[PDB]
Amino acid sequence: VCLFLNLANDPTIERIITPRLALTTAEFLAYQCEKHVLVILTDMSSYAEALREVSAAREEVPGRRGFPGYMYTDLATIYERAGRVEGRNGSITQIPILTMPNDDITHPIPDLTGYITEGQIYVDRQLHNRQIYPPINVLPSLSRLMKSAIGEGMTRKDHADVSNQLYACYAIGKDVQAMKAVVGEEALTSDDLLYLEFLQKFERNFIAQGPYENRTVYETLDIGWQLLRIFPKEMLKRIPQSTLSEFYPR
Amino acid sequence: GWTGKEAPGPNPRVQVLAAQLLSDMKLQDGKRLLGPQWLDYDCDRAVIEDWVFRVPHVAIFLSVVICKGFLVLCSSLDLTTLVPERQVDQGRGFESILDVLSVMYINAQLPREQRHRWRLLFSSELHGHSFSQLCGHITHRGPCVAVLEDHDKH
């Protein structure tokens, strides 16, 4: 690990050139030294607070909400130094980390970083206020390149069907508890409480992790498969039969 | 429908059922068969004659080993109330925990009025591994027999 710290009491221009030291180190380790690099850029919203501060010193024109006109090509100057190349045996993965102000996703730092990058993770507040770690909201989170990261040869051949089935029984479970608060408790049928047994056991066995518990991918799906056995076989309709007859019964 | 699968080797439910009948074997001393001195009792006609009086099944089972292969159709027994009828819905390949000597044991201590039909209400390998399914399938369905088997084959 190389660690480029840059504090708030430090000058505002060192924060501008910090994510170009961390990528020039990364574009050396992967495209000259053939490693798989992961870049973490913590608080990229403070990058756009310094790029607004540098540009205001030069009396330049502000665009959307005070940020400069050239911020779309200045975020992409950072993000688009990534990906695998042909010929070299290295790759660069980037995980920038933002702070949406007052939980507004429509701010220009998340609106323009969702124009260049390929997904979201959405650390949620309503899961933090009920003491869950990590508080990841899987309903608005996405990764647009999930289809070229899983399957045979990468993880296992049941990854793509466990994932979008847990995503369906967490989506229905969030509708049941949204509707049972507004209509009442006695309207639940017996299949209907089952999507709440999942929702409680999904947030305690899958999403709750503990900050030093390192699960590999083979023990995230074996946690995920004993959560799909909460349902019977006839109710898992997002999972095909040719993989239900190999992994489901235990 | 109660075809409890025989084990290649000896069936372990034949063994533990047969020693249960010998627990009502009250020798004249008043003290039950305990410890490895339980094999050497001079059990005369004085002591087996209440055993067939106390245990109804050693009187029942002799009336079905003899009177079913020999096929005496005039027999005034009841076979509907000895072995219940397993009513599961079709289409689902479903084996049970309890084999036929066990469901001929539990059926003996029920009321006589109910002993003919055992219908499936919840089972963990067909209706999920959920308590919300268990509480939804067995509520409001009359008298029922819950039976479960843990990790140590108990």
Swiss-Prot record, chain A:
Its localization reads: Apical cell membrane; Melanosome; Cytoplasm; Cytoplasmic vesicle, Clathrin-coated vesicle membrane
Please give the tissue specificity annotation from the record for this chain: Expressed in brain (at protein level). Expressed in all tissues tested, but highest in brain and in adrenal medulla.
Q: Which residues form a coiled coil?
A: none
* Annotated residues for binding of ATP: R144
Superkingdom of the source?
Eukaryota
Q: What does this protein do?
A: Non-catalytic subunit of the V1 complex of vacuolar(H+)-ATPase (V-ATPase), a multisubunit enzyme composed of a peripheral complex (V1) that hydrolyzes ATP and a membrane integral complex (V0) that translocates protons. V-ATPase is responsible for acidifying and maintaining the pH of intracellular compartments and in some cell types, is targeted to the plasma membrane, where it is responsible for acidifying the extracellular environment.
Which family does the UniProt entry place this protein in? Belongs to the ATPase alpha/beta chains family.
Its quaternary organisation is: V-ATPase is a heteromultimeric enzyme made up of two complexes: the ATP-hydrolytic V1 complex and the proton translocation V0 complex. The V1 complex consists of three catalytic AB heterodimers that form a heterohexamer, three peripheral stalks each consisting of EG heterodimers, one central rotor including subunits D and F, and the regulatory subunits C and H. The proton translocation complex V0 consists of the proton transport subunit a, a ring of proteolipid subunits c9c'', rotary subunit d, subunits e and f, and the accessory subunits ATP6AP1/Ac45 and ATP6AP2/PRR.
The protein here is known as: V-type proton ATPase subunit B, brain isoform
Organism this protein belongs to: Bos taurus (Bovine)
Which part of the full protein does this chain span, and how long is the full protein? 257 to 506 of 511
